[PDB]
Point group: C6
Chain length 166, copies 6
């Protein structure tokens, strides 16, 4: 239980990268054209959208992917340009911290589901108008899947840390 962990980790990482690059880019293509509210005011759709989804999902996840691999890049570089184990320790620690932080943030911003009805009260929208949504179920599914994958990665990293460190 000290060798296969690395295989599983690398494999889930590549799995995640592939699923994020092949699919997500087009699910969120019609998020603003088919987001329609019930009113005549010019300026309510944009505001209610910006307030519902401030930071889209897929960009959060791209940022996650990138900022989760920087320690490996730093290791690659410091190895090409040349005490050593110390590096491994610190990079493992930072990896764990980043994973945990991003998972908690994912829970706090978006949640576990995506409904089909929002209610906005922003200006210029007159009191409490209703606004609809597109493709909610696919987005729910994608949310849950990525949550699970990130949890698996957390577990593996923690087991490795416990096995290695004091």
């Amino acid at each position: 239980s000290t060798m296969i962990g690395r295989i599983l980790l690398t494999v889930v990482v590549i799995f995640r990268i592939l699923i994020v690059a092949i699919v997500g880019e087009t699910v969120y293509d019609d998020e603003q054209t088919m987001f329609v509210c019930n009113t005549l005011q010019p300026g309510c759709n944009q505001a209610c959208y910006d307030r519902a989804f401030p930071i889209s999902h897929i960009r959060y996840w791209v940022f996650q992917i990138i900022m989760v691999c920087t320690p490996s890049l730093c290791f690659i570089t410091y190895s090409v340009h040349q005490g050593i184990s110390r590096f491994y320790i610190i990079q493992v620690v930072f990896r764990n911290a980043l994973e945990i932080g991003f998972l908690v943030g994912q829970y706090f911003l978006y949640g576990f589901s995506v409904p089909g009805l929002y209610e906005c009260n922003r200006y210029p929208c007159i009191k409490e108008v209703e606004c609809y949504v597109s493709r909610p179920t696919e987005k729910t599914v994608f949310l849950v899947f990525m949550f699970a994958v990130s949890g698996i990665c957390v577990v593996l990293n923690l087991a490795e840390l416990n096995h290695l460190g004091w």
Copy 2:
């Protein structure tokens, strides 16, 4: 009947990859713009679409493709990083299981055909609205073709397992 099976399987897999990649990305490009219902309510088209096609076909099939090849990647990385036959056995088993599960799921979610009329009763739609569809026949054909290919793969894997199994 113990050698040509591998060739047939590999060729079928690549055939499937190529078809899915080249063709089935533009058939499903106008699935929401040309999905039109008979009503004036703002919010019926989106809901009736989401309820008709929750998870599109092509994303199901991309996920299938990826999650069916992971054991080969695990084998690859374990052979690059270095009891052995045991690995072959377990990955064969997992391959068979995944393939069967995905085929059964494909039957249970979508079915064998795609009609040209859907009656929806979701909110905000008034009682039993009617809604139309785009390019049903191509989608039927694509369904049937992929079903057949997956069945062939199932048969080949079963024959291999039997030839090798106790």
Copy 3:
């Protein structure tokens, strides 16, 4: 006149692949947006289109291209993985059969021309409405050209089979 056959065959195949990949993807980009009928019913354009063109030409031709090269791939594989002439014979036979079948199917489904007026009576369309097509002449030209190329390939394969046959 016993060797140049290979030259002509390979060159024709590559010619066909190039013409299909460079050109025939934007001609059929506006096939449903500029297909307009004369009526107010919601749901007549989609039905009359699906009935006129159930399977766009270009996907038929992509399928034709792929499913005609599979014997060469199987040969490549069985060679990398290792009585032999027998393989050549069977794959030649299968190539000829596939080519003939696809040509006949191409004649039976579509035809030799593409008119500029269709008449549909499908539901919901009330009796016998008129519908207009886009870019008919280019499609006619492309039909004829591909028919000719496939015929040339048929002739070459037949001559080879005769030269080799008993």
Copy 4:
């Protein structure tokens, strides 16, 4: 005056390919959306377009590019699969013939200019309606440029044939 010809010819060929590929694909992107006629009939815009520009320019020129290089491909493959002088001679002849034919056809189909007003009398269009055009001047310029390049190629090939002929 027997070596620089090859340089000039290859250079103009690559120049032409580059220009075509880089530029032409987007000038002709809005040829049907901004082609507007003065009438209310459904079906006049499509017909008057099809009759004005049956075969677009850029596809003619792609076909021209391809069908002019086939002899070189044949020569390459035959030199890989193994007289040489006879082959060189026949392929030169075919190159000259193809170039001349395509130039004459280019003159006969399109012409030297592209006006900004067309007049169609086709069904369903009631008698002699007027139809407008988009980006005429760029298309005129592109026409003239390609005409000149092809003429240069003709001249070079003919000078070579003379220098070599009997």
Copy 5:
């Protein structure tokens, strides 16, 4: 504190390039179609847009990326083409200057935030009409992030210059 600076600089640069290339090309895809003002005049939307955002952030940042790497390219060239430390020093100086200038310009043109309401009085707009922006929050976040990264690069370059200077 004289070695790890290199790895941090390189990694920050690559991280910035990756972010700018993967994400910030579709956020600014619908900046003019969903920019809507409250008036009937033809010509107010275009003018109020041009006056609000004369130079989109992403063009500025692409220019920044390119014009900051030119000294390294000049070094590469002058090396392939062949006193030397002098070159290193002058290019360090130019790098620092360019970075500082671009940061200050970024502060002066755009600012620290992007609001959701603009008020324009340009011709032809009659007397101070109101106009609504799209996706303000993502753009604010992007602004802040790039500001921070550029500041980090500034600090590292300053420390390097001091470690080496007189």
Copy 6:
């Protein structure tokens, strides 16, 4: 003052290539959809556009880029073959001439600025209607920038010719 010139020239050339191929293609994507005039006639927008911008900027500059590098290609070719300096002289001369001609043409066709209003009197437009423009402030910057770069290249080529010439 006889070595660094080559470096500066190559560097500005690649700089120009990149700035033209990375961004300049999307600024001019909405040049005809958001070009709107004040009238009801069908056929005034197309005519007034064609008369305002006959030959767009970016295509002029692509043509410039290509037709400025042909002498280097001819040199590459004639050098792959195996009196020689003569080639260098003539190619330098042609480079200088082409650059100067393209700069002067750029001044004569477009100018130094791009305004926000154009009055057109072409048929069918009735008696000097007014027409508006999109993004009239990025295009000015792009104009000025390319003008400056071309001027730098002119100066460097002139200095080289003088240093080398009689």
